[PDB]
Amino acid sequence: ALRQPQVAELLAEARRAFREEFGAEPELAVSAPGRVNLIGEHTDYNQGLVLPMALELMTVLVGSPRKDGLVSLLTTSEGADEPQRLQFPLPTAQRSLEPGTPRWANYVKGVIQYYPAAPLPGFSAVVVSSVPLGGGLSSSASLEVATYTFLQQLCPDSGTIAARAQVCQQAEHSFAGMPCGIMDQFISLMGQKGHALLIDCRSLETSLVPLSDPKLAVLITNSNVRHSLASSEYPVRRRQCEEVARALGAASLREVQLEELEAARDLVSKEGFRRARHVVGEIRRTAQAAAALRRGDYRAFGRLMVESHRSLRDDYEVSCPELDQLVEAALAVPGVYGSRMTGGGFGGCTVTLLEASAAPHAMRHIQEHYGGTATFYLSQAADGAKVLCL
Ligand SMILES: O=C1CCCC2=C1C1(CCCCC1)N=C(Nc1nc3ccccc3o1)N2
Ligand SMILES: CS(=O)(=O)c1nccn1Cc1cscn1
Ligand SMILES: OC[C@H]1O[C@@H](O)[C@H](O)[C@@H](O)[C@H]1O
């Protein structure tokens, strides 16, 4: 399992790079984590239920206010596209920022563009990250939330945490061209160490669910693949879900149950019906999973994870031979409660819930039974966005 750097080490890397780059020590430091979704896939934009936890993998951003209305950025992240630096002036009423190259700067630009408070000053900042870029653990959401958290120090907003997630979400939409739901940004903002986070994506109610057992661990396996469908088929699923809700007279698939869906089978397409069945079933399973998690019922939680994956594979069709093979290998290992693809699909990571003692045995077997090269993360539930004054 990859070492996973602590905050103090990333902070120190960011600090040193900043000092060398701008000639002075930075004044502020913030962090925001990536995520793994335990269960509740492709429900968040359907106003469903999700149960993610924040990872120890995080994006760290150190910086200082400037007096010239200029923004100057540097990243050291492996995988970031060239150039590693970018400067631009703050947006104004007559001229707004715009997505372009380098791509990693669009996330930062986006948050700045839709930041709700004023006056925002210019600033200098160094970005570092332990979240694998585009690997399926929401590196971008961590970048957006870290950026938002940073801007709060420069110019405190005065709204809810949901308003913040939605700003970060808007950046992902408008500047990264990924019309994501609210989950990634919300868990990045609101995670707590030792807890998973049940999010009702209709009411925006959230609930901290304990998940801290020495005999229990969460194994994240990176397939290290990412089919182009991960980007292009995502928005298609949102339209297909919308089109099914429209035909049933429902505001969203949250208002629809399997039986109501059964009765209206001749009212939607075969493919649409399969899409809606996953969602409806997944929303149910996430409520069951949350309950199972509370009373410490790990075996039931695991089984519910396996149903989630089968549903994602057969009805919503957002899996791939890589993820499937990773899941099958995982379920063959003694001590494994459950396994499923996590995140958007078509590559990325799987999440596996197992007895802590089985993690070494599960890593060897999964790797040997995998045709590509898997990467492994053994993660505990971590905190959300934080701030440290330097
Ligand atoms: O092009 C892909 C498309 C799929 C999603 C993925 C993007 C890129 C774009 C530029 C690098 C490659 C991946 N990375 C973001 N996330 C991200 N998080 C970061 C944290 C700190 C610094 C830079 C960061 O980039 N997500
Ligand atoms: C990695 S990214 O998604 O931020 C990006 N890289 C080049 C451009 N864009 C954003 C673009 C894509 S579609 C509409 N906005
Ligand atoms: O469960 C599917 C999830 O896929 C992620 O890639 C996306 O960013 C989230 O908003 C959520 O829709």
Curated annotation (Swiss-Prot):
Top-rank taxon: Eukaryota
Matches recorded under InterPro entries: Galactokinase (IPR000705), Galactokinase_CS (IPR019741), GalKase_N (IPR019539), GHMP_kinase_C_dom (IPR013750), GHMP_kinase_C_sf (IPR036554), GHMP_kinase_N_dom (IPR006204), GHMP_knse_ATP-bd_CS (IPR006203), Mevalonate/galactokinase (IPR006206)
Q: Which GO terms describe its molecular function?
A: ATP binding; galactokinase activity; galactose binding
Top EC category: transferase
- Enzyme Commission designation: 2.7.1.6
BP GO terms, sorted = galactitol metabolic process; galactose catabolic process via UDP-galactose, Leloir pathway; galactose metabolic process; glycolytic process from galactose
Catalysis performed (reactions):
alpha-D-galactose + ATP = alpha-D-galactose 1-phosphate + ADP + H(+)
The UniProt annotation places alpha-D-galactose binding at 35, 41-42, 44, 184, 234
Active-site residues, record numbering mapped to chain: 184 (proton acceptor)
* Positions contributing to ATP binding: 134, 136, 138-139
Q: Name one Pfam family in it.
A: GalKase_gal_bdg
Q: What are the Phosphoserine sites (modified residues) in this protein?
A: 228
Q: Where is this site: Transition state stabilizer?
A: 35
Pathway noted in the entry: Carbohydrate metabolism; galactose metabolism
* Disease implication from the record: Galactosemia 2: A form of galactosemia, an inborn error of galactose metabolism typically manifesting in the neonatal period, after ingestion of galactose, with jaundice, hepatosplenomegaly, hepatocellular insufficiency, food intolerance, hypoglycemia, renal tubular dysfunction, muscle hypotonia, sepsis and cataract. GALAC2 inheritance is autosomal recessive.
Kindly state the subunit structure of this protein. Answer: Homodimer.
User: Which family is annotated?
Assistant: Belongs to the GHMP kinase family. GalK subfamily.
**Briefly, what is this protein's role?**
Catalyzes the transfer of a phosphate from ATP to alpha-D-galactose and participates in the first committed step in the catabolism of galactose.
Entry protein name: Galactokinase
Say which species the protein is native to: Homo sapiens (Human)
User: Source organism lineage?
Assistant: Eukaryota, Metazoa, Chordata, Craniata, Vertebrata
Which gene is this protein's source? GALK1
